[PDB]
Amino acid sequence: SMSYTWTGALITPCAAEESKLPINALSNSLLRHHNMVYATTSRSAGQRQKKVTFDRLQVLDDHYRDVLKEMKAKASTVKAKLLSVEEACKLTPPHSAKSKYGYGAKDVRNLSSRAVNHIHSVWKDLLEDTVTPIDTTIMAKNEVFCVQPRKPARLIVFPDLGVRVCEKMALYDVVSTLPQVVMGSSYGFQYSPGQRVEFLVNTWKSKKNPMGFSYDTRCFDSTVTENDIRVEESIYQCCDLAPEARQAIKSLTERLYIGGPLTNSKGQNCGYRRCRASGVLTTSCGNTLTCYLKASAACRAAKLQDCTMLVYGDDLVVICESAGTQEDAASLRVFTEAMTRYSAPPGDPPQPEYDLELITSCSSNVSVAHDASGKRVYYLTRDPTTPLARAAWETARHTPVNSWLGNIIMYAPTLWARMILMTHFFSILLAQEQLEKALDCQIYGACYSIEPLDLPQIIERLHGLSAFSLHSYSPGEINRVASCLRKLGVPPLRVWRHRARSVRARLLSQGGRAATCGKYLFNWAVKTKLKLTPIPVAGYSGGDIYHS
Numbered sequence: 287s288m289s290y291t292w293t294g295a296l297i298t299p300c301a302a303e304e305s306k307l308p309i310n311a312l313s314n315s316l317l318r319h320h321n322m323v324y325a326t327t328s329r330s331a332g333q334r335q336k337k338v339t340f341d342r343l344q345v346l347d348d349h350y351r352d353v354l355k356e357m358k359a360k361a362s363t364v365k366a367k368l369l370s371v372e373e374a375c376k377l378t379p380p381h382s383a384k385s386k387y388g389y390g391a392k393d394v395r396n397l398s399s400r401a402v403n404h405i406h407s408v409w410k411d412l413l414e415d416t417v418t419p420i421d422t423t424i425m426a427k428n429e430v431f432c433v434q435p436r437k438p439a440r441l442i443v444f445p446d447l448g449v450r451v452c453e454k455m456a457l458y459d460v461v462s463t464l465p466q467v468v469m470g471s472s473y474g475f476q477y478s479p480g481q482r483v484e485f486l487v488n489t490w491k492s493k494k495n496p497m498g499f500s501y502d503t504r505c506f507d508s509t510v511t512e513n514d515i516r517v518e519e520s521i522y523q524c525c526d527l528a529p530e531a532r533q534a535i536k537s538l539t540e541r542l543y544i545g546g547p548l549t550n551s552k553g554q555n556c557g558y559r560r561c562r563a564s565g566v567l568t569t570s571c572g573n574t575l576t577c578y579l580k581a582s583a584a585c586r587a588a589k590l591q592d593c594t595m596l597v598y599g600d601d602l603v604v605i606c607e608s609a610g611t612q613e614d615a616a617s618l619r620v621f622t623e624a625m626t627r628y629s630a631p632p633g634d635p636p637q638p639e640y641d642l643e644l645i646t647s648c649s650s651n652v653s654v655a656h657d658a659s660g661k662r663v664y665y666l667t668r669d670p671t672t673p674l675a676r677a678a679w680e681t682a683r684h685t686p687v688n689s690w691l692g693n694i695i696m697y698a699p700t701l702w703a704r705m706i707l708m709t710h711f712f713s714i715l716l717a718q719e720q721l722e723k724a725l726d727c728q729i730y731g732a733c734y735s736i737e738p739l740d741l742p743q744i745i746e747r748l749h750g751l752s753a754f755s756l757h758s759y760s761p762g763e764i765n766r767v768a769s770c771l772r773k774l775g776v777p778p779l780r781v782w783r784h785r786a787r788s789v790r791a792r793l794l795s796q797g798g799r800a801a802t803c804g805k806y807l808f809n810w811a812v813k814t815k816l817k818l819t820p821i822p823v824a825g826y827s828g829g830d831i832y833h834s
């Protein structure tokens with residue numbers, strides 16, 4: 287089965303697209319090498335299409351069925367409810383794509399009669415019709431990167447707004463509750479960054495001779511077959527569900543999740559999908575279950591001992607008991623052979639690691655710093671190149687997602703988020719007096735509206751108070767950061783230390799919540815430190831979800 291079939295009609299933009307870095311008066315203070323930053327556009331869509339279009343073969347053995355039976359047994363203990371129209375409506379993001387049938391995200395949120403009526407008719411159609419393929423729109427994502435001495439745009443596929451509300455009605459409570467029950471500690475979404483760090487370190491230490499590896503499948507969404515999506519549905523249907531929910535789930539699976547026609551922004555037929563849609567509600571849960579299933583079965587084929595898996599979407603890490611260097615390397619080949627038979631070959635072959643910090647997953651690795659007392663603190667960091675390129679773009683242009691804000695929240699303990707992102711953007715916010723203005727950002731693919739003034743509390747709850755006093759970062763983390771700055775022509779860290787004193791002083795001067803940001807976020811910048819005391823899960827990744 288081919289992942290996609292194409293008609294030849296182009297994938298078209300729905301608005302003007304910028305590829306070149308926009309520049310303003312603030313741009314040079316962050317980043318000088320402007321021509322290294324770019325954004326992807328629909329002009330590279332043709333290139334992506336070629337990468338994501340291929341034949342899938344699948345060979346399923348007893349290890350696969352055994353694991354599947356175990357997953358279903360756990361799924362059978364889950365009781366999920368239908369959300370009402372109103373509940374599903376409130377989960378709809380304010381700036382989500384409008385319907386073709388005369389209403390938008392804000393009409394849905396307000397329970398407008400036109401929106402509510404169309405949702406009711408869409409739902410009724412899902413109950414009464416389990417065969418007719420549902421239309422989808424295919425777009426090129428506009429995303430910002432540094433040149434990798436260019437990436438073609440990713441493709442997003444999603445159905446109409448009315449359908450997206452109905453998905454939430456049928457399945458939101460399922461995708462929010464089921465994966466944790468089925469996968470236990472392996473379900474990565476449940477942890478805050480601080481809990482995840484703690485889980486990883488405790489898992490590494492739980493093995494006598496630890497070995498770990500990342501496995502990243504090439505173009506995972508395209509590797510998802512009709513069988514995979516049907517198997518996912520069979521898992522959902524194990525739950526204790528309302529009869530209405532069962533029918534809607536069967537309907538959505540047959541008509542939408544397994545595949546359907548692809549329409550561009552201008553309304554022309556682009557082709558046909560027989561793989562995972564990126565923009566449906568079940569994408570995150572589905573990829574996580576399917577990755578868990580294939581990898582768990584692949585662990586058994588390779589005879590890996592005392593495995594602990596961590597899975598988040600298509601990202602996978604296994605930590606297990608080492609059987610020896612040679613024995614480990616051999617068993618990974620078998621793992622990859624098993625995964626390939628299940629349709630999920632790797633982009634890069636997996637490498638066994640005997641140090642936790644050398645494992646990268648979701649672009650992140652563990653590193654170590656020290657708190658005020660000098661005790662070791664583990665935290666998750668990443669290469670700051672992409673965060674910094676995106677920050678430079680957002681310095682000059684207002685975007686749908688404020689990646690700088692998400693990056694500060696998710697990587698708050700990092701050397702680069704604290705010294706560069708906090709310092710740069712708080713200076714900008716101060717200059718415009720927009721500290722209290724709530725901004726859209728994404729945490730684990732879930733959309734939130736957050737005021738910068740609330741960052742101290744948000745950081746404390748996600749990382750603990752230690753995130754405001756970490757020092758003595760590792761030479762390797764420091765060198766990676768300093769090397770990235772030279773590469774992009776970002777000023778060196780010593781300049782940011784100077785700038786943070788000013789920004790701290792400016793924040794302290796305004797009193798109130800502003801001064802609290804000065805005290806906690808910038809305590810790293812003063813030599814005479816101020817004692818930091820206390821300041822005063824949800825289950826929806828990707829697939830168009832918002833919370834107040």
Ligand SMILES: CNC(=O)c1c(-c2ccc(F)cc2)oc2cc(N(Cc3ccc(B(O)O)c(F)c3)S(C)(=O)=O)c(C3CC3)cc12
Nearest residue numbers: 474479596597598601603645647648650666696729730731
């Ligand atoms: C299976 N892999 C893991 O679960 C993770 C490992 C990992 C690293 C090394 C290792 F050996 C094992 C695991 O690191 C992680 C770091 C993140 N974060 C960054 C982050 C990455 C992507 C997104 B996204 O666009 O969806 C995002 F929102 C945040 S965060 C806030 O710091 O916790 C995450 C979050 C849940 C997605 C997962 C893992």
Ligand SMILES: CNC(=O)c1c(-c2ccc(F)cc2)oc2cc(N(Cc3ccc(B(O)O)c(F)c3)S(C)(=O)=O)c(C3CC3)cc12
Nearest residue numbers: 701756757758759760764778779780781783810811812813
């Ligand atoms: C109030 N500020 C200070 O106390 C700090 C001084 C300092 C040194 C001399 C001086 F005269 C005045 C100040 O250097 C620091 C270094 C760091 N680190 C990050 C780091 C590393 C390299 C560079 B550098 O080459 O430019 C850098 F600027 C920062 S580290 C080694 O990992 O602990 C920190 C951590 C973030 C909190 C604080 C200070």
